Amino acid sequence: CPICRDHKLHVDFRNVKLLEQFVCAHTGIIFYAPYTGVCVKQHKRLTQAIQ
Amino acid sequence: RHTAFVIPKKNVPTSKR
Amino acid sequence: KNRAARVRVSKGDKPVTYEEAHAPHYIAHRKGWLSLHTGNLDGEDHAAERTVEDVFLRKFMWGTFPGCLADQLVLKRRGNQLEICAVVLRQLSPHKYYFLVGYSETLLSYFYKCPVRLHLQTVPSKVVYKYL
Amino acid sequence: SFFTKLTADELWKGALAETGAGAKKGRKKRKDLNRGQIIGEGRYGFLWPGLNVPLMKNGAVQTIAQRSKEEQEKVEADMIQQREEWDRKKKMKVKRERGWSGNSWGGISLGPPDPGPCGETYEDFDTRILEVRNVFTMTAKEGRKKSIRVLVAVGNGKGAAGFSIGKATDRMDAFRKAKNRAVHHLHYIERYEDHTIFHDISLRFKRTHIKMKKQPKGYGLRCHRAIITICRLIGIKDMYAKVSGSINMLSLTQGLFRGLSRQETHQQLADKKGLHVVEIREECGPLPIVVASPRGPLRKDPEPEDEVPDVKLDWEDVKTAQGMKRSVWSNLKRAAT
Amino acid sequence: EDSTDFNDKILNEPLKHSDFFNVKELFSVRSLFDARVHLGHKAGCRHRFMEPYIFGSRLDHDIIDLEQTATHLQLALNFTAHMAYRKGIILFISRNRQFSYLIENMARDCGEYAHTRYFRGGMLTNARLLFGPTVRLPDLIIFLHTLNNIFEPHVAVRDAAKMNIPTVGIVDTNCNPCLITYPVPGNDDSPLAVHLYCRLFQTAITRAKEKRQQVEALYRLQGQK
Amino acid sequence: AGSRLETVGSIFSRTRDLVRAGVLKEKPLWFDVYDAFPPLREPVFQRPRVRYGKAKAPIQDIW
RNA sequence: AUAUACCGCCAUCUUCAGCAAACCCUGAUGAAGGCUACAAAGUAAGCGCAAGUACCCACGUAAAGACGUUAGGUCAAGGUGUAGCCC
Ligand SMILES: [K+]
Ligand SMILES: [K+]
Ligand SMILES: [K+]
Ligand SMILES: [Mg+2]
Ligand SMILES: [Mg+2]
Ligand SMILES: [Mg+2]
Ligand SMILES: [Mg+2]
Ligand SMILES: [Mg+2]
Ligand SMILES: [Mg+2]
Ligand SMILES: [Mg+2]
Ligand SMILES: [Mg+2]
Ligand SMILES: [Zn+2]
């Protein structure tokens, strides 16, 4: 998936520029996993880091 | 397998009067 | 339908030379012969021997100058001289042409026991008469 | 016998059998064997001065020499390796970006249209295939004749887009005809805020029904895959569309362009009625947003307020608003489009 | 630096005047009436899109409202003059064989082009193949007759619109004016009417060309000094 | 070049829109003239229909 | 062995005049279709016919005769793909 294919992308609550890519800029909702294709494991880590 | 292969080519300069 | 020595019509992208563009019924009308000797004149002999020699010389030159010949050979015989006129391309270096000329003339002179000469005319590319 | 041998062209023409009755009514690859061969190189490994080796060495003319058995083995082995590498490159397969499905032509890009004769260019336009069909016609002599019919769409992503059909015996010729012709039949599509349509569009073209809904930003393209392709060429980012009746690709494409080209902008509505066009957004509260004002005089009499509008409603829209629409296939999660 | 002043004094200046070439002095409702421009075809031949321009029917013979003819003719002549002023290519078209010779002479005299012969398929939509890749198409097409000789619209009306070429056209009561850019309702049969049209367009084009030379010459004299 | 869809709008609207969209690099020679002195009616293609029922032509007899 | 993998050389309609790239237009941009000379959408390189040439003429006779049709004929002219035999 997009997160797991690049080992230099780190899902961290401080790396906000990466987290913004998984949030809708118009509605503020977090994209569901099939939208971007991230696996369930990384989608949970993204949801926790975003929160 | 897949066969919808796009292969672009152009005619040869063999049309000159 | 007749087939012999006919380059058939295509999509207009096949370049043909002047010789290739004329069917057999144009021989002596619009195109000449590729070999001239006295063997086929009335009352002359040794037509069979001249023919075998011509067939060999064409194969020899084709494989001796691979990818260089831009047209068919013209074979001429006067007395016991044998002149080979060939139109070649300008891809090989001149040194290799001079080597192959000195090599082929000498080898053929000893093979057919007669003075053989090779005249080369170079062209930048195969002369196109029409696109069939 | 030396006199029974033939040339390479004659040998390949026979072995390939590209011509023949078997290849006429639907009833092996050539290899150039003179490719890596060097004039003068033979099995015995002789070094001919002036042919396969330099004529002069150290200012002196070289003499006839012959490579040693070991040195000739390396030359032979090196030539076989050079052959495998050359052949390996051909077996390498290019990574194709598939279209709607793996083996379909639909959705695949064809690149920009070819530059016109008068130095005209179309680098700003992208081309997409919508349909490839093998059409057959019966002829007196040959019988069942095979041809190709292609439908392609072009667009610059900024409102200018068009489509065209291409027909030819060969597929690549049909591709050329279609995309070069489409760039001369361009529509201009008005876009609201450069991302959606100006209003809901509902039309029928022949037997194909298309219903399009204006959507806010971030909604995406939730439409028939062919409509998604065309919307990307036009520059529409957010829209919902539903296709009903016949799903004929050509009628779908032609119907889509008719509806999108016949839409009324907000400025055209303001000029036609001589009134302000005011937009109300729930995210902006009761703030009235004027989107268009009439360039001519402004009317003084309000628009008549009919207590009950006599507009025809779509049962699918009403049934969905009442929570009575039940479908396991609606509102499914999908990849970003 | 100097190009903007050129295009501003020569190309943009005439577009700021309602009648820069004074084409309203070339005709009047009376002169059109004396040329029988108001006589139309019988009511049984009327085209539906011509009803707005018809004053009425006098004993089953449609009468063309010359008040509208005058306003349409004013716009058509004004547009033709501006295009001649801008050095546009003007092509006259007409399949009426009674006036073929007249129209070809008028085109040669005003320095423009005529096509009164059989119109071959693709003269406009396939011109680059018929003439050459660098051929320049007409900037304006003037139909003195919009119908071909089987009483159908001349194919060039459709093809001029396809190639986005504006068209001026005399439209009789049996003609279809929907695709004509500047239609002029009028009689296209009587020699007096056709002769009047040829004089008006020829004079409008000749004046505009002389005006372009007067303005250019004056612009150059003032430029040096 | 210009769109050849002669039944979609008019030569003016099609030209104006393609000029906006940057498709046409230059405006044609006639565009500025049309804009300054437009025709009374925008030349839009229309399909002629026969009249049915009680529809009649509004042409009156001249007496 | 396979002419039903083919080159090569041919039969046949042909004692024919048609074939066709590249475009354009019509049919709502469907499979498809495209002429009227007081002409109404077709333009067409090239190929064939024709013209030239051979024989005693400009006549005649030869020669020529495209694209396609019959998986037509020939693996036994020669060559050759595939398969098979190698005391
Ligand atoms: K055969
Ligand atoms: K054989
Ligand atoms: K065999
Ligand atoms: Mg025969
Ligand atoms: Mg697959
Ligand atoms: Mg009339
Ligand atoms: Mg057979
Ligand atoms: Mg004769
Ligand atoms: Mg014969
Ligand atoms: Mg002949
Ligand atoms: Mg058989
Ligand atoms: Zn993952």
Side-chain angles (χ1 to χ4, degrees):
Chain A
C1 79
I3 296 298
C4 296
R5 69 181 178 179
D6 187 359
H7 70 98
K8 290 174 178 174
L9 296 173
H10 303 284
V11 178
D12 185 73
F13 78 102
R14 297 172 297 172
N15 191 14
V16 295
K17 292 296 184 183
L18 176 60
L19 302 180
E20 289 171 12
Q21 301 181 24
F22 295 89
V23 179
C24 184
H26 307 288
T27 59
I29 64 87
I30 301 171
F31 300 130
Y32 48 70
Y35 187 86
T36 61
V38 295
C39 58
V40 175
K41 185 185 179 66
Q42 294 300 336
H43 184 262
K44 292 173 176 174
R45 298 180 63 253
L46 280 165
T47 297
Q48 293 174 354
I50 288 167
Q51 187 59 44
Chain B
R1 69 184 67 93
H2 297 164
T3 57
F5 290 10
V6 62
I7 43 173
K9 300 185 184 181
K10 190 187 178 187
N11 188 27
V12 186
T14 60
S15 306
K16 317 191 187 189
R17 177 167 174 172
Chain C
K1 295 185 295 187
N2 300 322
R3 316 292 298 187
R6 286 169 171 83
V7 180
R8 310 209 72 85
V9 65
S10 68
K11 314 178 72 176
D13 61 323
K14 188 198 301 184
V16 300
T17 62
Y18 184 87
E19 314 309 328
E20 300 168 0
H22 288 82
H25 61 268
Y26 290 118
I27 292 167
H29 298 251
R30 302 184 185 180
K31 68 192 295 193
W33 289 284
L34 291 169
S35 64
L36 283 176
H37 54 86
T38 60
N40 289 319
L41 297 162
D42 183 74
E44 294 297 340
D45 295 323
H46 308 325
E49 292 79 340
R50 302 295 80 80
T51 306
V52 171
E53 299 165 0
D54 287 2
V55 171
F56 172 78
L57 293 169
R58 295 183 186 282
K59 287 187 66 55
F60 180 89
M61 292 291 293
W62 184 258
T64 303
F65 298 80
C68 306
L69 294 176
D71 211 332
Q72 300 297 327
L73 300 176
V74 181
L75 306 175
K76 300 170 177 296
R77 290 185 175 85
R78 298 191 303 274
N80 67 328
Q81 297 179 65
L82 176 67
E83 284 188 348
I84 305 174
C85 312
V87 181
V88 297
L89 298 171
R90 296 172 177 174
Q91 300 183 7
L92 280 185
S93 63
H95 289 82
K96 298 183 183 185
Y97 276 121
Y98 276 94
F99 180 101
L100 295 172
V101 165
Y103 153 82
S104 63
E105 285 182 349
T106 301
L107 199 74
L108 298 170
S109 296
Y110 281 77
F111 191 69
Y112 286 138
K113 311 300 179 188
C114 68
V116 182
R117 265 191 293 181
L118 177 54
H119 303 274
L120 297 180
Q121 184 194 144
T122 64
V123 294
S125 54
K126 205 159 178 170
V127 184
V128 175
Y129 174 67
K130 60 189 294 195
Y131 287 95
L132 284 172
Chain D
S1 180
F2 179 71
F3 294 97
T4 53
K5 293 169 175 287
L6 299 178
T7 61
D9 286 358
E10 293 167 313
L11 289 171
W12 284 113
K13 189 179 178 177
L16 295 176
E18 293 177 357
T19 58
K24 294 174 191 169
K25 307 187 181 189
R27 293 155 175 166
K28 186 63 179 177
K29 289 187 171 184
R30 179 165 184 167
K31 184 184 288 168
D32 186 4
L33 299 177
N34 305 319
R35 186 266 302 176
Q37 294 203 61
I38 301 161
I39 298 179
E41 294 293 350
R43 190 176 72 180
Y44 293 163
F46 275 95
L47 305 173
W48 308 119
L51 188 61
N52 58 326
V53 301
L55 179 63
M56 289 160 290
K57 182 177 178 179
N58 304 329
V61 181
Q62 292 191 71
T63 59
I64 295 172
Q66 192 180 4
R67 278 192 285 262
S68 60
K69 175 175 172 56
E70 293 74 5
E71 188 181 353
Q72 183 61 17
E73 289 290 357
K74 177 178 175 181
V75 169
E76 298 291 354
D78 195 328
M79 177 166 55
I80 289 169
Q81 176 172 4
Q82 183 184 19
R83 181 186 63 198
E84 297 177 353
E85 297 177 358
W86 176 274
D87 185 8
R88 181 179 178 182
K89 301 166 194 172
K90 317 310 179 190
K91 306 305 188 187
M92 303 308 302
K93 304 182 180 184
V94 176
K95 188 197 179 186
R96 296 173 56 268
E97 185 175 357
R98 64 171 179 268
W100 301 332
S101 70
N103 196 69
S104 74
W105 289 99
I108 287 171
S109 178
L110 283 175
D114 299 329
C118 61
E120 202 164 42
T121 56
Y122 320 91
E123 303 95 349
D124 196 3
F125 285 81
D126 179 54
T127 304
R128 293 286 175 173
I129 300 171
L130 301 177
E131 188 187 34
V132 178
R133 184 183 287 251
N134 293 341
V135 293
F136 292 87
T137 185
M138 296 295 295
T139 56
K141 300 185 179 180
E142 296 182 2
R144 199 161 174 269
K145 182 201 179 191
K146 182 177 176 296
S147 176
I148 308 295
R149 191 189 77 188
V150 181
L151 175 61
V152 312
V154 297
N156 67 344
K158 299 186 292 297
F163 67 98
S164 185
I165 296 174
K167 297 187 74 177
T169 297
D170 180 61
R171 191 184 306 98
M172 304 311 305
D173 296 331
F175 290 156
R176 185 191 66 256
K177 295 179 189 178
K179 71 176 185 174
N180 291 340
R181 188 177 188 278
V183 82
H184 302 301
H185 297 76
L186 291 174
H187 308 247
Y188 182 80
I189 308 304
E190 294 286 3
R191 296 174 299 159
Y192 170 82
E193 292 181 353
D194 295 332
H195 81 91
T196 187
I197 57 178
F198 271 95
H199 54 80
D200 293 357
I201 297 168
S202 174
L203 78 166
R204 188 191 74 263
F205 186 90
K206 297 184 172 182
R207 289 292 91 198
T208 301
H209 302 257
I210 312 181
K211 184 163 196 299
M212 291 173 281
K213 294 173 183 171
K214 181 175 179 293
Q215 297 295 345
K217 291 187 176 181
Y219 184 89
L221 297 173
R222 292 173 53 177
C223 311
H224 188 281
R225 60 191 186 180
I227 295 179
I228 292 172
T229 298
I230 292 167
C231 282
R232 293 202 181 105
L233 295 174
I234 294 166
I236 292 166
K237 288 77 172 183
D238 306 300
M239 191 173 72
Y240 174 87
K242 182 70 181 75
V243 181
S244 297
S246 172
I247 314 301
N248 180 9
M249 182 62 63
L250 180 51
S251 296
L252 171 51
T253 306
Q254 199 165 1
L256 183 67
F257 276 92
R258 168 171 292 200
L260 291 173
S261 63
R262 297 180 179 182
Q263 57 183 334
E264 178 179 30
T265 69
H266 290 146
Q267 187 61 57
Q268 295 172 10
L269 182 63
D271 298 353
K272 177 169 68 186
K273 293 183 176 298
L275 295 172
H276 291 285
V277 183
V278 182
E279 184 184 47
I280 302 300
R281 297 195 158 192
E282 299 188 18
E283 62 272 20
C284 299
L287 180 66
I289 302 152
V290 182
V291 293
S293 300
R295 300 201 183 90
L298 183 61
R299 265 170 50 189
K300 293 283 182 175
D301 53 317
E303 190 74 19
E305 301 180 15
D306 188 2
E307 303 179 23
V308 189
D310 195 1
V311 303
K312 299 198 178 185
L313 305 173
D314 194 6
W315 174 230
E316 297 177 14
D317 293 334
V318 170
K319 184 169 59 175
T320 301
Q322 291 173 188
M324 294 167 62
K325 175 59 175 177
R326 300 181 174 86
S327 181
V328 302
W329 299 101
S330 299
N331 306 321
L332 289 181
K333 300 182 180 182
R334 299 172 186 256
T337 62
Chain E
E1 302 178 3
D2 191 11
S3 179
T4 55
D5 187 9
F6 181 96
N7 304 321
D8 184 10
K9 281 184 170 184
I10 289 163
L11 293 173
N12 292 331
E13 177 59 15
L15 301 179
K16 298 182 175 185
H17 303 282
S18 58
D19 197 355
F20 183 75
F21 304 97
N22 193 28
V23 302
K24 75 186 71 174
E25 198 184 10
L26 296 175
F27 67 96
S28 62
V29 175
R30 164 55 69 174
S31 72
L32 299 168
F33 191 90
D34 294 330
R36 308 177 204 169
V37 174
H38 61 284
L39 300 182
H41 292 263
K42 284 198 73 183
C45 308
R46 190 190 302 114
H47 196 285
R48 178 161 188 177
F49 296 159
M50 289 301 299
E51 293 166 1
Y53 312 111
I54 290 168
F55 181 80
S57 57
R58 176 62 175 177
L59 292 161
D60 289 324
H61 291 88
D62 288 336
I63 301 295
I64 298 164
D65 184 10
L66 291 183
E67 299 295 352
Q68 298 188 71
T69 302
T71 56
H72 288 80
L73 182 59
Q74 176 61 21
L75 288 168
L77 286 174
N78 182 79
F79 188 85
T80 300
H82 279 286
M83 294 307 300
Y85 178 92
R86 299 160 78 87
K87 298 179 176 176
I89 292 170
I90 304 175
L91 175 63
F92 292 89
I93 297 181
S94 169
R95 294 290 292 115
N96 193 323
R97 300 169 63 249
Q98 173 172 354
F99 305 110
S100 170
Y101 184 77
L102 175 77
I103 293 168
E104 285 177 337
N105 276 326
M106 180 264 294
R108 187 184 67 260
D109 292 335
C110 63
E112 299 299 346
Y113 306 87
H115 192 328
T116 67
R117 309 296 179 162
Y118 172 80
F119 206 86
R120 290 186 296 162
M123 296 308 285
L124 294 171
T125 65
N126 204 14
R128 302 197 179 191
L129 190 64
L130 301 173
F131 300 104
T134 64
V135 68
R136 183 182 166 192
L137 284 185
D139 300 301
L140 171 64
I141 295 174
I142 303 178
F143 293 91
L144 300 173
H145 300 79
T146 60
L147 297 174
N148 60 31
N149 291 326
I150 55 155
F151 309 94
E152 313 293 309
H154 198 289
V155 71
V157 177
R158 182 200 70 197
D159 283 1
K162 281 180 179 294
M163 306 307 298
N164 287 267
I165 300 168
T167 51
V168 173
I170 307 292
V171 289
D172 213 338
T173 63
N174 62 340
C175 301
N176 187 335
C178 65
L179 281 179
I180 302 295
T181 312
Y182 290 90
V184 181
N187 183 353
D188 68 8
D189 293 292
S190 304
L192 284 172
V194 176
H195 282 62
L196 177 60
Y197 304 142
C198 291
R199 287 195 302 275
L200 296 176
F201 286 116
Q202 181 173 350
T203 302
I205 293 170
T206 296
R207 281 192 194 176
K209 290 185 178 187
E210 295 173 1
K211 188 70 177 181
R212 176 60 181 267
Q213 297 299 318
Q214 296 161 12
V215 176
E216 280 179 330
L218 178 62
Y219 175 86
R220 297 300 184 186
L221 176 62
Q222 179 176 349
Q224 292 182 341
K225 299 180 180 180
Chain F
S3 172
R4 304 191 173 194
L5 305 169
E6 77 285 12
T7 63
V8 173
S10 66
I11 58 173
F12 177 71
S13 69
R14 291 194 302 277
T15 302
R16 179 191 61 201
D17 289 352
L18 291 181
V19 166
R20 291 168 50 203
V23 180
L24 296 170
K25 310 306 180 188
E26 302 183 25
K27 297 146 70 182
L29 184 65
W30 59 268
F31 190 82
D32 288 333
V33 186
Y34 183 109
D35 207 8
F37 317 101
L40 290 174
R41 169 184 180 274
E42 188 186 27
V44 174
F45 174 87
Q46 296 182 356
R47 197 92 64 192
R49 314 177 208 278
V50 304
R51 286 188 174 90
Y52 287 102
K54 307 179 178 182
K56 312 295 173 187
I59 309 304
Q60 306 302 323
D61 297 333
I62 296 165
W63 301 118

